[PDB]
């Protein structure tokens, strides 16, 4: 395979599905990554998080340079070697989980060189250019400076990438839109990245407690500044509707704890709704937690046991959850691949809500 | 398969190699047998156990009557339906977890009858009679005292079990021995429940503060006072090397908690002795826990990793430790009984001791 290729193989409207290849694998998208900590999803092995069908998992970086280091990671063959992934893996920068700022970077130091560097000691395959998320509400003028930073960083970002050759030859290199929800400021953090040029593009920003409407209406304005034919990256999102409604804006990949925290806490998401196991209505349903879903999980335990493992504080609830909200996950982005594939992503995108909701 | 067939296959000394044959399955002796809670081992799944080795679990009876409860457990289709378990259960008592005693039962009311009517509704394979383990020390008066009410309690779970016909038909009786350190008193108490009759035999009584040289002694005349035909089980036993002294005493049958627990906590056993994984050697240590276990842990991740697993109080820690350590055991067990078999039972428990102390 390439270093990386994005080839989009059907539309619908702003909705796209296709391939990004990469020397460890294809990402089918539009894609969901899950995300991790030493673990690739917390209480899952590996082949676990395979076999619910994800193509690469986000690694947290903020969590892996604290401990066990990545210097520590590196000398020990990096993060794939260490958690045995080896699948693409889209390294965070570290900043979001870190909020003195400065113009050198963060300290708390977190520059976009260390950034960076830190990614590259842990192997990352797709690696994302350090910024700051604005954050919401920020008026006009925070908006703009915050923006302005991050694009320089952006610039920084891409050097740094850009000066270490191994990187340079086998990693892709994303950048992050800023703005808050200002059209100008949205298209002027645009203009800037696609002046100098990256791999995919992420719109950051969102997700930051705006709400959904809000969100909806800045992605109607902001993904269609970025370049079609490189992937958009929606950082932070979300819920399954979350998920839906941005990819009929033009979103090709997303990430979120929500699948893998809502499960340890006991919810379960199902067509008809999430649901929260630990209610007395489940301790003795014999169903599994969605009556349609092809996971382990579904095919071998009730709502019945995993309510009980939930209420006493199980470890085996926590990964039974977890895989089966993880596997949920995969099964809502293939009905999405399948449905704009076939030239009905927008009647799924209307059963789906009718059904959920 | 019979309801109930122990075949002694071959013997070194005291030692004996050999399977039970039960409805669910075979299960191959000398045996250890994982313990539970609403998860067949904790943190684990039930075919992962099964990966390990495990022919028959412990089912935790007492956690169970607690939660969900017997009755809900039945009417979900029982125990073997509800974890995800098909072989073998066997179902303590939730006499030892419990410890007002009366001649009735305890009250914290279980009896004897209760007792036989939870393992019942959980749909147990092998049943212990209700017992009172005597606590050590004991003195000769008490320790009579506390055998006596035991053995009365053995028949009363001998006939409530009777009167079952499902459960007469379908699962085992073990009784259980005790008499503290006493020989006189256990004789009486071997004698009192070969008098009864049982499908196997427990030595009750042990492991409750004695230390090791002193329930050797008690094994060295209590275990050829029960039927040489039948099953020998030690309760709550051990450490790796009680369990090949007490297989060279004519033990067949063992549970204990440490391999689950000393997991979680850190601890690995090793054919070189236990590791505790959290210490700093093991920071950069990129050989598996063990050099010869044929473990899928073993072959897929590094003592380093799981370092920091245990280190983050990350669940895939716990569930990594467990897993290696249940196969340990199960390849303890593996090596005694090809070592009985093969008539070099005495240099393995020598050599075993060499290299792990
Ligand atoms: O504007 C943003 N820039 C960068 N990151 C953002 C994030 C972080 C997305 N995921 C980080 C994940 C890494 C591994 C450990 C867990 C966290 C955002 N998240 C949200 N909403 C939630 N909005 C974001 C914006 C940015
Ligand atoms: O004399 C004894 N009678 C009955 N039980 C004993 C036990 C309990 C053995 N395992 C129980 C296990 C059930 C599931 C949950 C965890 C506990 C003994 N354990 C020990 N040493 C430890 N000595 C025992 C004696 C008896
Ligand atoms: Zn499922
Ligand atoms: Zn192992």
Redesign the interface.
Known sequence: RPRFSFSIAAREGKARTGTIEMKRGVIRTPAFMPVG???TV????PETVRATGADIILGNTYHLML??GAE?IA???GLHS???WDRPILTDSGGYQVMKQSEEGVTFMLSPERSIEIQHLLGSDIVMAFDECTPYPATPSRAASSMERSMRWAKRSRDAFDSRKEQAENAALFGIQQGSVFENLRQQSADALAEIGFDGYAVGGLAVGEGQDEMFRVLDFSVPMLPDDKPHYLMGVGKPDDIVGAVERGIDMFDCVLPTRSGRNGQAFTWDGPINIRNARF??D?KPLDSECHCAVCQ???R??IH??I??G???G??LMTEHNIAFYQQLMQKIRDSISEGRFSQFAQDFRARYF
Chains 1, 2 share one sequence.
């Open positions: 900590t030493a673990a917390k209480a899952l092995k401990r066990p520590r000398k020990l063959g260490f958690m045995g301790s003795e014999l071998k335990w009730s019945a046991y009980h493992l209420r006493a199980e470890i085996l926590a990964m």
